[PDB]
């Protein structure tokens, strides 16, 4: 019955498009469709001096990479899970599944 699908992605526009596409698919099948849950973004960061030597005013930069994520929890029969999984390929988004 239940499935939880994690769409994980370090680009916001892609994840927004792919989730809108999958939401449209859900509402076109109409199994009591719903929005995705927007997850707390993972943020990995590094802070370093700009100059390659000691000279000048010490100026510092913070680089941070953001891994966005969205979860769909959903009700489907096993055939529809097996058949719909054909949607979950050729994406820069990484896709993962949980089941009970």
């Amino acid at each position: 019955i239940n499935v939880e699908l994690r769409l994980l992605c370090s680009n916001k526009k892609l994840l927004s498009d792919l989730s809108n596409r999958y939401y449209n698919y859900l509402f076109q099948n109409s199994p009591t469709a719903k929005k995705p849950r927007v997850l707390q973004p993972f943020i990995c960061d590094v802070t370093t001096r700009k100059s390659p030597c000691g000279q000048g005013t010490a100026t510092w930069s913070k680089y941070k990479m953001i891994i966005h994520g969205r979860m769909f929890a959903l009700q489907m029969t096993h055939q529809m899970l097996k058949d719909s999984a054909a949607f979950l390929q050729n994406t820069d988004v990484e896709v993962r599944l949980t089941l009970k």
Binding site: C44, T48, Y63, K64
Partner: protein, 65 residues
């Protein structure tokens, strides 16, 4: 490599083996340039602060704020 050393006990007749722990600069050389100084070790990078800034945008890091 985990190197091993022999050592003798107080009798100077019985022998035992002990392992050398890998620590310090000797194995943490920059993956782009072999440098021993200013290596960022976080997130399992092993890249120096000079090399990082030219490649950061290829890896996918950005300055948001």
């Amino acid at each position: 490599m985990n190197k091993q050393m022999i050592k003798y006990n107080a009798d100077l007749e019985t022998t035992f083996t002990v392992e050398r722990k890998d620590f310090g600069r000797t194995n943490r050389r920059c993956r782009a340039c072999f440098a021993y100084n200013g290596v960022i070790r976080k997130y399992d990078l092993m890249i120096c602060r000079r090399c990082f800034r030219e490649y950061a945008g290829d890896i996918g890091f950005k300055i948001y704020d």
